[PDB]
Every structure is written in C-alpha cells, then in structure tokens.
C-alpha cells in the first residue's frame, strides 16, 4: 500500500510487539528501505533475510518496488542527461552499485 | 497671484499664468514646485498645444527641471521640445551655437535613445554645427555611424575634459551597440554568423565581453538574437535601424531594385510558364 | 485630395469630434478597394511645427452584411462561383 | 513557574489546550493562553508539534477586531511562532504580518528593520508569481528604496543579465558589519544554524539567477565557456545544475563528445510558423506598403 509511516507505526502497534520475532525485523528493515528508497539498503536487507523472504513467493512485489521505483529513477536520471552528463552516457550515470548494476536498464 | 485670481482671459490665460510661475520660479527654487505646476502646464495644455510661445517657455521651465536633475534621458525629449519649439532662428546665432554645443553635451549626458545623430538634417542646429568646433559633431557621428577612430571618441575627452569619465563605461556600451547596427547594416546582407573578432574589433574590447554585450542588447530589447557562441560567432535577427544615408539610399535602391526587378522578372517567367493553361 | 479638405474636415468635426472622409472613384480601374479612411491627429513634428494637422491613413475595407447581396449577385449574373482549381491563383499571381 | 519549565512540561497543559474552545470562548485570554505553548514547543523543538499547536493557532481566523494594541502586541509572538520553521512561502504573509504594527507604531528603526525584514525573505522565497508581483507591490515604497542594498536586490531581479557571486559577497557582506538595522541581516545572513542555510538559499538564488536567464537564452554556446560564464566551474556546474535540473521544468541541452555542448531545445518541430510568421507578416506588411507608402508619396506630392 506504500505507506511505510503506518508500517512503522503498526510495528509500533502493541499487539505486533506482543507477537514479535525476526520476521518483524524483516518487516522493519524493508519498511525503512522503502521509507527512504535506498535501493542498496533494499537489496542488502532483502538478501540478509532470504530464508524468511521465501515465505513471500510474491517477490515480484519486491523487485517491482525496485522496478517501479527504477522507472522514475531512470526518468530523473534521463532528464539530468541534458544538464551535465558524465562519462559513458549510458552505463555510468546511475548509482552504479556492485560490479555493473546493469543488465536491467538495457534489459528494459 | 493677483493676475491669476482676477484674470480668466480668453487667449489662454491659464497657461500664461503657469508660465509666469515658471519664469519667476527661477528664484523660488526648482524642486518643491517644478513637478506640481510645471507638469500642470501640459496638464492644462490638453486643449490645443500649438501656441509655440507657451511651448518655448514650457521648454524653459522643463529645462530648469532638467537643471535640477531629474531624468537625464528626458533631455532628448526636452530637445524635442526646444528643437521642436523653435523653427526660425529668432535669437542670435552667437548664442545658438553654444546652445548647440551644450545641447550635444547634455544629450550625451542622457543616454536613453543612444542614436543622438538621429535628426541632424535640422537647420537651427546644423547652421551651428558648421560654425561650432567641427569634431564634436563628428564624434556625435562616431556615436551615430561608426564606433571606431579613437581620435574621435577620445577627442570627446581631449576637448571636453569634464563629464565624460562619469559616463565612460556607458559610452563604451553605446559604441558596443554601434557595432550592433554596423554588423547587419553596412556589411553584406548578414553573414548569418558573426565572429567574436568582429564585435570585439568594432567594440575595441576583449573576447570575454561580447557575451555580456549581446545579453545586454537583449536587456535593451533592440535585437531578438540567438546567442551563437559555440564558435564565438554570433547569429543575427531584427535590429532597430539607423539613419539611411544618401549613399545608403543609393545602395538601398541597388539591392532593393535587385529584389524588385528580379522577383518581378522571374515572376513573369513563372507566369510565362503558367500562361499556357489559362483557357 | 487637396488642401481645402482639412478645412472641410475640421469644419464638420464640430458635430461629432471625428469626421472620417471617404475617397471613392466613379470610374475605378487600377485601384484596389475604393474605401479609404483618414483621421486628423498630430505627431506634432520632429521639428515641432505650429500645429501640423495631418490626415492619418486609417486602414479600410469593404464591409459585409447578411443578405445585402440579394440584389447584387442576382444583378451581376456573371460570377463564376468557386473557381478553386482553375486560374484564380494565376490571376492573383499576375496581379 | 515552579522551575520556569523543566522536563515537567505540556503533559499537564495539552489537556487544557483544547477545552476553552467549547465552553465559553473569550476572545483575548484564549489568545493569551494559546501563545503560551509555542515557547513550550520550542523546548520540545518538534516543529511538527509546533504545527500541531499552530494548527490550533490558525483555527482562530477571527483574529482582528480587538479592543486595543494587544493583538498588535500579540503579533510579535505570532511571528516568533514561525520565524525559523515557517515555510518559504508562509514567510510571505507571515513576514508581511510583521508589518501590521510598524504601520501603526511611531518608530523609525524598528520600522526600518520591519522594511528590511519585509524585503529580505524575497531571497528566501522560491521562484513564484505571488513573490514576483509582491515585489511589484512593495516596491515604490517610502524608505525601502532609500537603501541602495535594496537597489542591489531589485537590480538582481530586473532582467538579471548575469551576476558575480563575489560582488554579491561584497555588497551583502559589508551589510553584516554595517549597522542601521543589524537584526534582519543577522537573522538571514549573520546567523549560522539557519542563517547559513539561508546562505545556501542565497547560493540557490545565484545559481537560479544563472539558470533562469540561461533558460531564456544561450542557443549554441559551448560548455567550459558556459561554466566560466556561470562563474562556477564544470564540476560545480554538474552539482549546481543537477540540483536545478531536479526542478525538472526547464529543458536545456548538453552533450559531451569531447567536452562540447549544443542547444536549440525542441529539435525544431516547425515548418509551420516559418510560413506563418515569414509569409503572413511580410505579405501583410507589403499590402500595407501600398496603402501607406503611396499615401505618403501622394502626401509629398500634395505638398509639391
């Protein structure tokens, strides 16, 4: 529903704190990751809890928050191309994280 | 005040009252009363401004308003009221030529129209121009036609020592718009792209000021140009023109009749091909 | 026009303060539209002369009104309506 | 007032900050008590709690028509409310509500700093229409244009033409030492924790001063020439122009290819206005050429 404020406020809910565990750490870390849209935070905290990430087989939600954010990320990184573009106009403009973060942009 | 309160005479008593205020305003001071009643003169001149005596006295009070400094640039219009007011010389030439002297000086001191050699086929100044110092007119022509000959545009500092350094950078701006009329007026048609050497050479300025120059011309609003400086070579649009010379009347006849009879002749050729299918 | 026309103009600008003249031609062959408009205002002059009261050429046209051509296009009878596709363009070209 | 405010705080008075609006509203003591918690929430320092209680402030739109100068003396507290955290368009009506008592008062220095504080937030306010005609309204003032630094302010806004940041450092950093009013120049520039953020907003002003006229102009200039006419270098150009291409409402054009850019932003979808402008303008001017050149030729042969 993309209201991470209420996700934070309802993991601050009393009965969720009654029924807490490690999956609530997954919910809180991915909640902060979507709260601030640090896609590196998203990837890192996502892959930290992969064994509990299996219980959501809809990871299309997760890689579509990656994707459906990356669309407007490539929109804000496609308008700055006429402000001052830097070296390798197609594959050094983005965040460029962890050894060629492409095969996604070119894939799209 | 007596001959204003008892006199409502039919041959324009109110404007002669206001010019009496103007002509004896010479002692009462000229800042408390100038705006109010001197502006009230042309407020009351709303019937028919064709007396030319009230208009010459109106120049006299508006020129005292020019003395008590407000709007140096209004002196060109105040010249359009004195130069406008007088037609035949009706006062001694032996004071008129010094009036033309200080008229050129004070029209130089007000820089709003920046083409002050606009009307110089005007008799009751040109008969003074050919009796005053002959180079002051030629340096008005160095602000009218061409922005070079440092002899002229520095002889205006040689002869006229005061009141030039107080306007020197703005006079450099005036010669830097004189290049803007030159480059599309005198040169062959436009060249479509005009180099930094050209503007800087007529401007006698560096490379890194013609940019400020062409933006300042846009702030003035005489040219709608595209600032072509990928090559430092500037592209041209419409400019507010300068005075068409006699030789420029002739060269205008040349390129204009070139256009006229070429378009007319090739038009008759197109119609000569289009002549066969009328029926 | 002639120089008496300003006296005509200003002598009839007393009823309404504007009186626009109309040049016409009873034998027109070379002109375009007969209707012409002047107005008598002043710019006074560059030399600011004593009242250079000038006729000022206002733009003009032939007007238009619905069903005033009932007589006209029935009378003239010679009109080739809608010659788009033939020779009107070259008449405009020549002229 | 036991401890004049310890951690014992509004936990006993937020219960009381909602009652009197329902029993019997008195139009002054409710105001004199609704001012009491903005200094409490400056100690809380939560500015969204300060706008909870400012939501309780601005639910009292019936504010004028009192007995006396008390609301006109409330206004200093009403502006102490949103001096710092007041948003950069809220400062428009807020820092013109600072002026309601200096219209009435008989001071000329508190009125002078009232004028310089009704004008020095124009720098703070982002590019808008209400600001742009607000400075059309407040211009033509009585003692505001008497400050040549306000002539600098307006000169930085009329056609704008370029600016040098260091000449601005001169003209508006000699005002932080020269004193006639001293408190608004402190609050905007002399301060650090917010005044230096307003220095950053002044850097926004100098770079948007660049970008506005360079979006108006510069078709086919290069890039190092661009940065040296920006008065800020090429890495400073990518910083200072990335943070205004995030404005994402100005379309510009740059390329590298060796370090050379170009322009003409819409890629010219026109063969239409060429015909429109060129031919309609020229042909109608030429049909005027008959109607008025032969008019003047007939005039000059009336007078011959």
């Amino acid at each position: 529903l993309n209201t991470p404020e209420d996700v934070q406020a309802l993991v601050s809910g009393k009965l969720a704190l009654r029924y807490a565990g490690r999956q609530t750490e997954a919910l809180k870390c991915v909640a902060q990751a979507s709260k601030n849209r640090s896609l590196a935070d998203f990837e890192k905290a996502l892959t930290d809890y992969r064994a509990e990430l299996r219980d959501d087989p809809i990871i299309s939600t997760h890689l579509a928050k990656l994707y459906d954010n990356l669309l407007e990320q490539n929109l804000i990184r496609v308008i700055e191309p006429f402000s001052r573009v830097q070296i390798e106009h197609i594959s050094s403009l983005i965040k460029l994280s962890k050894a060629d973060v492409e095969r996604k942009l070119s894939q799209m | 005040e007596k001959t204003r309160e008892k006199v409502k005479s039919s041959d324009e008593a109110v404007i002669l009252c206001k010019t009496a205020i103007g002509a004896l305003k010479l002692n009462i001071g000229d800042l408390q009363v100038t705006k109010e009643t001197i502006e009230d003169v042309e407020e009351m001149l709303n019937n028919l401004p064709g007396v030319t005596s009230v208009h010459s006295r109106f120049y006299d009070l508006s020129s005292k308003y020019y003395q008590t400094i407000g709007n140096h640039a209004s002196y060109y219009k105040d010249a359009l009221r004195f130069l406008g007011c007088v037609d035949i010389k009706d006062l001694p030439v032996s004071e008129q030529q010094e009036r033309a002297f200080t008229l050129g000086l004070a029209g130089l001191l007000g820089e709003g129209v920046f083409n002050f050699g606009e009307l110089l086929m005007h008799p009751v100044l040109e008969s003074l121009r050919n009796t005053d110092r002959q180079w002051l007119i030629d340096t008005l022509y160095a602000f009218n036609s061409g922005n070079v000959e440092r002899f002229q545009t520095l002889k205006t500092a040689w002869g006229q020592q005061p009141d030039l350094a107080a306007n020197e950078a703005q006079l450099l701006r005036k010669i830097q718009l004189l290049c803007l009329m030159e480059m599309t007026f005198t040169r062959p048609a436009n060249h479509r792209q005009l180099t930094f050497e050209e503007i800087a050479k007529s401007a006698k300025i560096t490379v890194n000021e013609v940019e400020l120059l062409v933006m300042k011309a846009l702030s003035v609003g005489l040219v709608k140009g595209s600032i072509d400086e990928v090559d430092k070579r500037v592209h041209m649009t419409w400019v507010q023109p300068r005075v068409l010379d006699l030789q420029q009347i002739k060269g205008m006849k040349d390129r204009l009749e070139f256009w006229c009879t070429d378009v007319k002749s090739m038009e008759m050729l197109v119609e000569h091909q289009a002549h066969d299918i009328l029926t | 026009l002639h120089k008496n026309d300003i006296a005509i103009n200003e002598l009839m600008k007393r009823y309404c303060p504007n009186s626009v003249l109309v040049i016409i031609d009873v034998k027109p062959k070379d002109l375009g539209l007969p209707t012409e408009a002047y107005i008598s205002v002043e710019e006074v002059h560059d030399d600011g002369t004593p009242t250079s009261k000038t006729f000022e050429h206002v733009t003009s046209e032939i007007g238009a009104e619905e069903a005033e051509e009932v007589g006209v296009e029935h009378l003239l009878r010679d009109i080739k309506d809608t010659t788009v596709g033939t020779l009107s363009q070259r008449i405009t070209n020549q002229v | 007032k036991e401890q004049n405010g310890d951690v014992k705080e509004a936990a006993s008075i937020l219960q009381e900050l909602q009652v009197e609006t329902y029993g019997s509203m008195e139009k002054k003591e409710r105001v004199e008590f609704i001012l009491e918690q903005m200094r409490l929430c400056l100690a809380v320092k939560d500015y969204i709690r300060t706008q909870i209680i400012s939501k309780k402030i601005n639910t009292k739109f019936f504010q004028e028509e009192n007995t006396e100068k008390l609301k006109l003396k409330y206004y200093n507290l009403m502006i102490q409310l949103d001096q710092h955290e007041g948003s950069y368009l809220s400062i428009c009506k807020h820092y013109r509500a600072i002026y309601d008592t200096p219209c009435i008062q008989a001071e000329s220095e508190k009125w002078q700093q009232a004028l310089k504080s009704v004008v020095l937030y124009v720098i703070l306010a982002p590019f808008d229409n209400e600001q742009s005609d607000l400075v059309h309204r407040i211009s033509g003032d009585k003692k505001l244009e008497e400050i040549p630094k306000y002539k600098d302010l307006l000169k930085l806004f009329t056609t704008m033409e370029l600016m040098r940041w260091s000449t601005l450092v001169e003209d508006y950093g000699m005002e932080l030492r020269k004193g006639s009013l001293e408190s608004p120049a402190t609050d905007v520039f002399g301060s650090t924790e917010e005044g230096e953020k307003r220095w950053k907003d002044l850097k926004n002003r100098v770079v948007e001063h660049n970008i506005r006229i360079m979006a108006k102009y510069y078709t086919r200039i290069t890039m190092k020439r661009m940065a040296q006419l920006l008065d800020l270098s090429v890495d400073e150009s990518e910083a200072f122009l990335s943070n205004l291409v995030v404005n994402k409402t100005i379309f510009a054009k740059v390329d590298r290819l060796a370090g050379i850019i170009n322009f003409q932003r819409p890629k010219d979808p026109n063969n239409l206005l060429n015909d429109w402008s060129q031919k309609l303008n020229s042909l109608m001017s030429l049909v005027n050429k008959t109607t008025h050149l032969i008019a003047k030729e007939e005039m000059i042969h009336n007078l011959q």
Side-chain angles (χ1 to χ4, degrees):
Chain A
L1 197 66
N2 286 312
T3 63
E5 179 70 27
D6 289 330
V7 182
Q8 183 177 1
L10 291 177
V11 302
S12 296
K14 60 186 184 297
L15 200 62
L17 293 172
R18 174 64 176 86
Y19 290 160
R22 297 295 304 274
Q23 294 171 353
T24 190
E25 296 181 355
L27 291 171
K28 287 175 71 67
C29 70
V30 180
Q32 186 58 256
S34 66
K35 178 72 169 66
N36 294 319
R37 292 173 182 86
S38 177
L39 196 63
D41 190 6
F42 173 69
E43 178 68 30
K44 181 172 69 67
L46 183 64
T47 322
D48 286 329
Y49 290 159
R50 179 62 178 84
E52 291 85 5
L53 188 272
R54 183 178 176 86
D55 286 329
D56 191 7
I58 308 99
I59 69 166
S60 176
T61 296
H62 301 84
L63 291 174
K65 295 299 172 290
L66 187 145
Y67 179 72
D68 293 327
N69 205 165
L70 182 53
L71 268 72
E72 65 267 17
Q73 292 304 111
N74 298 128
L75 288 175
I76 58 98
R77 298 295 296 173
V78 87
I79 291 167
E80 189 178 359
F82 54 83
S83 181
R84 184 168 169 88
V85 67
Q86 72 264 20
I87 301 99
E88 192 64 32
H89 310 293
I90 185 59
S91 69
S92 294
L93 262 62
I94 202 171
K95 176 65 179 295
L96 204 284
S97 63
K98 293 293 184 289
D100 182 78
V101 77
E102 279 188 352
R103 200 71 74 191
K104 182 72 173 178
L105 286 77
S106 63
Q107 196 182 10
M108 292 309 113
Chain B
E1 295 171 355
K2 183 176 179 179
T3 57
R4 189 181 64 85
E5 72 191 2
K6 74 181 181 180
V7 174
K8 56 179 179 67
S9 293
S10 295
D11 285 333
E12 294 296 321
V14 56
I15 49 94
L16 66 90
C17 287
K18 300 300 179 291
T19 58
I21 303 169
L24 278 78
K25 200 192 264 77
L26 277 69
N27 300 116
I28 72 171
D30 291 327
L31 190 60
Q32 62 183 354
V33 56
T34 44
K35 176 175 171 61
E36 292 87 0
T37 190
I38 283 175
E39 185 173 358
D40 190 75
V41 180
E42 80 266 10
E43 291 170 359
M44 295 306 291
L45 199 62
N46 203 3
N47 190 6
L48 198 280
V51 179
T52 302
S53 179
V54 72
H55 193 76
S56 180
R57 299 290 183 181
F58 179 74
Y59 166 69
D60 299 332
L61 45 84
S62 296
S63 67
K64 291 295 291 183
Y65 180 71
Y66 175 71
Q67 294 298 109
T68 56
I69 295 295
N71 197 359
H72 295 288
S74 66
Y75 187 75
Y76 186 75
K77 188 183 288 294
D78 214 4
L80 294 178
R81 293 186 175 95
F82 177 64
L83 194 153
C85 86
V86 69
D87 286 333
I88 52 98
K89 296 181 176 63
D90 70 8
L91 86 99
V93 174
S94 178
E95 199 269 336
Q96 285 179 355
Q97 63 182 358
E98 293 84 3
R99 290 188 63 88
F101 176 79
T102 188
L103 175 65
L105 289 177
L108 190 63
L109 291 174
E111 297 176 357
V113 78
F114 49 80
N115 53 5
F116 188 74
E118 187 175 1
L119 45 84
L120 265 65
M121 200 62 69
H122 187 267
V124 300
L125 59 88
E126 77 175 4
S127 66
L128 313 169
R129 293 194 293 121
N130 294 117
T131 64
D132 200 1
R133 58 188 190 180
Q134 304 295 318
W135 60 268
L136 180 62
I137 296 98
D138 200 7
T139 192
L140 294 176
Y141 289 161
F143 289 155
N144 193 10
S145 299
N147 55 353
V148 291
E149 293 93 10
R150 187 78 268 174
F151 182 79
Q152 286 303 115
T153 178
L154 184 59
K155 183 68 67 175
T156 184
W158 282 100
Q160 179 63 38
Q161 296 293 324
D163 289 329
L164 205 71
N167 303 112
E168 185 177 3
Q170 301 175 356
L171 289 170
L172 291 174
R173 181 62 191 90
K174 288 177 70 175
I175 70 168
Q176 284 181 350
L177 55 86
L178 199 55
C179 74
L180 298 172
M181 58 75 68
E182 280 181 349
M183 64 181 73
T184 182
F185 181 76
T186 306
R187 300 282 78 81
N190 54 11
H191 300 276
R192 191 64 60 94
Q193 200 170 5
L194 285 174
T195 183
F196 71 101
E197 182 182 1
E198 192 268 333
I199 304 108
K201 180 179 73 175
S202 292
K204 58 191 73 174
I205 207 66
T206 184
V207 179
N208 290 315
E209 287 294 323
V210 301
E211 305 81 357
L212 288 81
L213 192 159
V214 297
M215 289 181 290
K216 190 70 174 176
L218 290 160
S219 69
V220 169
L222 56 89
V223 64
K224 300 177 288 293
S226 67
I227 303 97
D228 190 2
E229 283 167 349
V230 68
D231 304 333
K232 302 187 284 184
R233 290 179 176 269
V234 185
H235 182 80
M236 296 297 110
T237 63
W238 180 84
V239 72
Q240 193 71 260
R242 301 296 189 273
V243 177
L244 181 70
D245 302 331
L246 187 146
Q247 62 176 356
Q248 294 296 320
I249 286 168
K250 299 303 290 182
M252 179 191 65
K253 283 179 67 69
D254 294 329
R255 298 192 187 277
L256 193 73
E257 202 274 337
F258 180 82
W259 172 258
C260 180
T261 198
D262 279 332
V263 171
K264 183 175 182 292
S265 63
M266 298 177 187
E267 177 67 26
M268 295 304 293
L269 290 174
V270 169
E271 296 166 359
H272 184 272
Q273 185 56 256
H275 189 275
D276 300 330
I277 60 165
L278 190 148
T279 306
Chain C
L1 61 98
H2 64 289
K3 197 177 179 181
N4 199 0
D5 293 328
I6 186 173
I8 276 89
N9 191 6
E10 294 294 327
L11 194 141
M12 70 174 69
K13 280 172 77 71
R14 66 184 184 181
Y15 296 102
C16 197
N18 45 2
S19 298
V20 51
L21 62 95
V22 170
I23 306 172
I24 54 101
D25 193 359
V26 290
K27 297 179 287 293
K29 64 184 291 293
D30 202 358
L31 53 92
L33 299 94
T35 58
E36 193 275 334
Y38 293 116
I39 199 66
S40 178
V41 299
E42 293 86 2
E43 49 189 2
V44 173
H45 204 265
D46 198 358
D47 207 1
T49 62
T51 316
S52 176
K53 185 179 267 80
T54 313
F55 291 97
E56 297 294 325
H57 175 76
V58 190
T59 180
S60 176
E61 71 182 2
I62 290 295
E65 182 61 33
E66 291 294 327
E68 72 179 3
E69 306 178 0
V70 183
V72 182
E73 287 173 346
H74 186 276
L75 282 167
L76 54 91
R77 180 64 65 189
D78 198 76
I79 179 65
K80 287 169 70 175
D81 44 352
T82 314
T83 59
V84 178
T86 170
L87 69 88
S88 176
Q89 60 274 18
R90 58 91 45 79
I91 287 174
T92 60
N93 284 317
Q94 288 185 355
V95 180
Chain D
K1 301 292 183 182
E2 286 175 350
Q3 285 74 242
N4 291 322
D6 47 351
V7 188
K8 279 81 174 178
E9 207 264 331
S12 301
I13 207 166
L14 287 170
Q15 57 186 357
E16 311 181 5
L17 279 167
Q18 63 187 359
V19 182
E20 294 84 1
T21 57
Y22 297 97
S24 176
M25 291 177 67
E26 196 274 330
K27 298 174 290 296
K28 298 185 295 298
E29 189 67 28
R30 190 60 167 168
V31 178
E32 286 181 348
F33 179 66
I34 208 164
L35 58 85
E36 191 271 331
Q37 70 274 14
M38 63 178 74
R39 58 187 289 168
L40 295 178
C41 292
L42 288 172
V44 174
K45 180 67 175 174
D46 191 8
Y47 293 112
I48 204 64
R49 177 59 60 191
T50 311
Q51 289 187 0
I52 294 299
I53 59 163
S54 177
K55 177 176 65 177
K56 190 60 184 293
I57 293 295
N58 61 14
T59 192
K60 299 298 179 70
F61 283 154
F62 182 71
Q63 191 274 125
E64 205 264 332
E65 198 266 326
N66 59 346
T67 62
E68 289 295 329
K69 296 289 292 180
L70 179 63
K71 293 299 191 290
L72 292 166
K73 287 173 69 176
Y74 172 71
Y75 287 153
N76 298 321
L77 297 166
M78 189 189 75
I79 67 168
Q80 190 173 2
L81 175 66
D82 295 328
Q83 177 64 41
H84 184 276
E85 72 273 19
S87 295
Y88 294 100
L89 195 146
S90 71
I91 60 174
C92 299
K93 301 304 290 181
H94 191 260
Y95 295 164
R96 290 185 68 247
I98 66 102
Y99 179 70
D100 299 333
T101 306
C103 183
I104 313 300
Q105 82 191 1
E107 281 89 5
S108 177
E109 294 86 2
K110 187 179 290 293
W111 185 64
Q112 184 57 258
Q113 70 190 358
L115 263 65
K116 293 301 287 183
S117 62
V118 81
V119 78
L120 277 176
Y121 69 94
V122 172
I123 294 97
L124 279 72
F127 179 77
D128 199 1
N129 56 3
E130 295 183 355
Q131 187 189 10
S132 69
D133 62 356
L134 187 60
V135 303
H136 295 166
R137 295 175 185 94
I138 67 172
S139 182
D141 202 356
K142 187 178 291 293
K143 293 292 180 67
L144 188 63
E145 76 276 14
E146 303 297 323
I147 292 100
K149 304 178 289 298
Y150 172 69
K151 182 177 74 69
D152 191 6
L153 185 147
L154 193 148
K155 179 177 69 66
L156 197 146
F157 289 148
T158 172
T159 67
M160 294 163 61
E161 279 297 311
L162 277 175
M163 67 169 292
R164 178 73 60 185
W165 183 64
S166 68
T167 59
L168 171 134
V169 167
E170 294 176 354
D171 289 326
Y172 288 166
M174 291 185 279
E175 68 181 4
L176 277 74
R177 179 64 180 85
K178 181 62 183 68
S180 173
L181 42 104
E182 190 269 335
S183 61
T186 300
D187 189 74
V188 178
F189 290 153
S191 298
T192 61
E193 63 274 16
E194 184 65 30
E196 188 63 33
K197 293 185 181 295
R198 298 170 186 177
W199 281 103
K200 296 293 179 67
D201 201 357
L202 174 56
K203 296 302 291 179
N204 189 9
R205 290 295 162 270
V206 304
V207 70
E208 197 178 5
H209 188 281
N210 294 118
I211 290 301
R212 285 183 291 252
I213 61 170
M214 291 188 187
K216 293 177 178 66
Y217 293 120
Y218 286 169
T219 297
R220 294 295 180 88
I221 203 168
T222 56
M223 191 56 210
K224 278 80 177 175
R225 184 171 174 85
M226 166 169 284
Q228 72 185 359
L229 270 65
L230 283 164
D231 297 333
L232 57 97
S233 180
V234 287
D235 195 0
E236 195 68 29
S237 297
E238 69 183 4
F240 269 171
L241 274 74
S242 299
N243 60 10
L244 292 183
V245 79
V246 299
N247 195 6
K248 67 185 175 62
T249 180
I250 285 94
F251 192 88
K253 192 176 291 184
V254 301
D255 291 331
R256 294 185 62 85
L257 70 90
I260 289 95
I261 73 169
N262 56 0
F263 283 100
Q264 189 57 254
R265 63 94 186 260
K267 291 185 261 74
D268 291 332
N270 189 5
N271 51 355
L272 48 98
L273 189 145
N274 302 112
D275 197 1
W276 282 105
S277 63
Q278 179 63 263
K279 293 296 185 287
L280 275 76
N281 192 5
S282 65
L283 268 66
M284 290 179 73
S285 180
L286 284 174
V287 307
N288 289 125
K289 291 289 283 188
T290 298
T291 61
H292 69 271
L293 268 78
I294 81 170
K296 289 182 289 300
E297 193 270 338
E298 289 300 323
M299 288 302 169
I300 66 168
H301 290 85
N302 292 127
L303 56 92
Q304 289 294 324

